[PDB]
UniProtKB/Swiss-Prot annotation, chain A:
EC number per UniProt: 1.1.1.267
Protein encoded by which gene: dxr
Catalytic activity: 2-C-methyl-D-erythritol 4-phosphate + NADP(+) = 1-deoxy-D-xylulose 5-phosphate + NADPH + H(+)
Listed name of the protein: 1-deoxy-D-xylulose 5-phosphate reductoisomerase
Pathway: Isoprenoid biosynthesis; isopentenyl diphosphate biosynthesis via DXP pathway; isopentenyl diphosphate from 1-deoxy-D-xylulose 5-phosphate: step 1/6
Enzyme's top EC category: oxidoreductase
Family according to the record: Belongs to the DXR family.
Length: 370, 373
């Protein structure tokens, strides 16, 4: 078989690597669609030139007019490209809750969704799950890919704990007082910030619960600054199975596209002929409260994980524009969450989620103002 | 659903641990037979009383007379017990190539063989494999238990490499010159020959051959790395560059519990890795200039047939010499290399158990001459 692949967010870090893997393996994969935001003119063209098909979407209006030929544009350009293209695999490499509609469309087409866009699942919640068949969503996120490989190591009831590794970000070891002084420069895009703030890991804890069906109190996080161990599963007998590789998104990308077949040569193996060490430390939850906050959001459930994420997108951008200090990103997430008791109802519709996100954006905006 | 277990070597370190896992899990397992040498009579008495089993083999006739009520004694006793006990699992935790006939009798009963005694597989080689059905031999060894767990991570043709971890023993990092002064006590939780085989790296050589025989993976894809914590017990690297590893604080009850109940895991068998406190897992290469045992094992394995039985028998003899104080530490493996490079004839497949025993005899006698002249 030669699987048909739509790449959403193809001008991005993940999309590009994905494109490299596909190009490297013509016999297994073919690109048949590319969606971007329009902000990276050059790349998108150099990308069309190399593919074969001009089946493409651009979000920004001013931007898509600067090119032409473009089958789809508008804020729902990405979503439309999914509905009308035929595929075996849809790779959602978009960023933010804006990936939610194409996530939802991807699932209706009955193709595999290789999910990089964790925010879609995080906001989506039970809604996105209801839209999927067992094993239709295959994670691209290196931790969740690692977990998926390690879970072949037993049966569901033999699972005791899922153990997430985290890099710790660039402020690993810093005091709360050290965090006051953090600049956009030191924390650097929205993906790098989420890492630095550990909001990313919070998102990943939520994504673990949704993907694998494991209680929040059995999802651990451990700081591993080498990022070679990508995550681990601890089983009931005391055994732990772990996945390791030098960090390289091509490995998890490859596995998600060709699941369950492994893609030969996708990435380099650990070198066990050269001395190395793998360190572990506890995450400082006093100084980095974002993870506990995500658990609290997750347990509450319903639309609350939408609120968590939406508050972040708003607070994080506001930090990037110099409008707030670094510790205020999560301070604002918490304030918003503390006031959101109403959104702990299950999202019946797409619009239930969009309402919660609107609510949270505007709540976060006001705390930025105040 | 209750599994009947014969434990060979019950009084030893593995056997004791196995009896504890069994006593902790009476719904899952039942001891139905015990075999021991006769050197630990208090222990054996206590096991008879705790398990209620009188189906016991004792190798030493005089010891069997002292304990009393022993149905099987003599060197063939353990074999006889296996042949004459209905069981679902035989746990062979004997030490050395003397485990060989019990191993073969066990496979012939059609019971699962939970193999702790790696020397009977190393020595029997293809003869043992011909007597086995797929999945019948299940590893108790911590490294191989790990590999079997990690192999669920792919399909056979997705494996690039099997990687065995080594503790490195008490002389990890030492030089060739340093090893010259090693004494029987420095080379001294396991038995005496097993601890010595760890210190000399022969154990790891044996484990390389055992990996090959158990998993049918070529020697050129079986690697070794030194990992001093012994938390990662072994790993598999896949064709896509991904590595899957199995990790736990070192404790044999884990792999024991898993071999008995394979493929079902046993709840609470051992402690899990705890990350509430900072730690590190280290890796370093092994220096073959200093510890040639492993490369030498790979060479014996590639030559095949009775060559692995020669490697092990030479060791059993040369190691015994070292403990009796008759040779220097480095000559254990020097003597194995010399016996092996002279054993051109033994590279033929054994047709019968007698081929293996002849090979062993020849290796032992040549080793003993090297200890002498
Ligand atoms: N970076 C990584 O390696 C990892 C990231 N992730 C996840 O992967 C996802 C994407 O990551 P990554 O590729 O690095 O992100 P990037 O920011 O590098 O790329 C984002 C992509 O989305 C496009 N885009 C931006 N705005 C819009 C819009 N309004 N409509 C449609 N498309 C738009 C961009 O196009 P353009 O910029 O040309 O406008 C670009 O192609 C995220 O959800 C993240 O959480 C998780 C695992 C690892
Ligand atoms: N211990 C460990 O942690 C590990 C061990 N292994 C392997 O498992 C095997 C067993 O090791 P271990 O338990 O440490 O060994 P021990 O020396 O602790 O135990 C040896 C057992 O065999 C019995 N025995 C000795 N001689 C004879 C004989 N002639 N006939 C019948 N029974 C005899 C002993 O009885 P007696 O009471 O007379 O001494 C004792 O029960 C070895 O092959 C070893 O390499 C593998 C993984 C790790
Ligand atoms: O999955 C990944 C990833 C993994 C490897 C390479 C790139 C991204 N991420 O989520 C990126 C952020 C995580 C991460 C993971 C690995 C590395 Cl090498 C880095 Cl710098 C960051 P985080 O633990 O700091 O939150
Ligand atoms: O499988 C085991 C074992 C593992 C853990 C605990 C006891 C024995 N062995 O073969 C014993 C010897 C091996 C070993 C393994 C782990 C440890 Cl903690 C030690 Cl001290 C020795 P070796 O790598 O030194 O050869
Ligand atoms: Mn990640
Ligand atoms: Mn071992």
């Amino acid at each position: 078989g030669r699987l048909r692949v739509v790449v959403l967010g193809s001008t991005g870090s993940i999309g590009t690597q994905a494109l490299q893997v596909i190009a490297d393996n013509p016999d297994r994969f073919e690109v048949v669609g590319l969606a971007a935001g329009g902000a990276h003119l050059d790349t998108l063209l150099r990308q069309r030139a190399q593919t074969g098909v001009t089946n493409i979407a651009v979000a920004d209006e001013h931007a898509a007019q600067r090119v032409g030929d473009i089958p789809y544009h508008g804020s729902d350009a990405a979503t439309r490209l999914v509905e009308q293209t035929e595929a075996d695999v849809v790779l959602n490499a978009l960023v933010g809750a804006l990936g939610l509609r194409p996530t939802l469309a991807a699932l209706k087409t009955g193709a595999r969704l290789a999910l990089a866009n964790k925010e879609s699942l995080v906001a989506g919640g039970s809604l996105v799950l209801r839209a999927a068949r067992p094993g239709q969503i295959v994670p691209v996120d290196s931790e969740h890919s690692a977990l998926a490989q390690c879970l072949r190591g037993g049966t569901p009831d033999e699972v005791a704990k899922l153990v997430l590794t985290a890099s710790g970000g660039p402020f690993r070891g810093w005091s709360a007082a050290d965090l006051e002084h953090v600049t956009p420069e030191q924390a650097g895009p929205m993906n790098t910030l989420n890492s630095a703030s550990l909001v990313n890991k919070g998102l990943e804890v939520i994504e673990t619960h949704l993907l694998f069906g494991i209680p929040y109190d059995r999802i651990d996080v451990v700081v591993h600054p080498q990022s070679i161990i990508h995550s681990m599963v601890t089983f009931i007998d005391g055994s732990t199975i772990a996945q390791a590789s030098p960090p390289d998104m091509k490995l998890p990308i490859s596995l998600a596209l060709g699941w369950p077949r492994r893609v030969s040569g996708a990435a380099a193996a650990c070198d066990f002929h050269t001395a190395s060490s793998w360190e572990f430390e506890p995450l400082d939850t006093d100084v980095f409260p974002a993870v506990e906050l995500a658990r609290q959001a997750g347990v509450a459930g319903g639309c609350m994980t939408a609120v968590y994420n939406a508050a972040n997108e708003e607070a994080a951008a506001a930090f990037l524009a110099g409008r707030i200090g670094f510790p205020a990103i999560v301070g604002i997430i918490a304030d918003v969450l503390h006031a959101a008791d109403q959104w702990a109802v299950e999202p019946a519709t797409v619009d239930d989620v969009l309402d919660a996100q609107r609510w949270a954006r505007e709540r976060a905006q006001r705390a930025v103002s105040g």
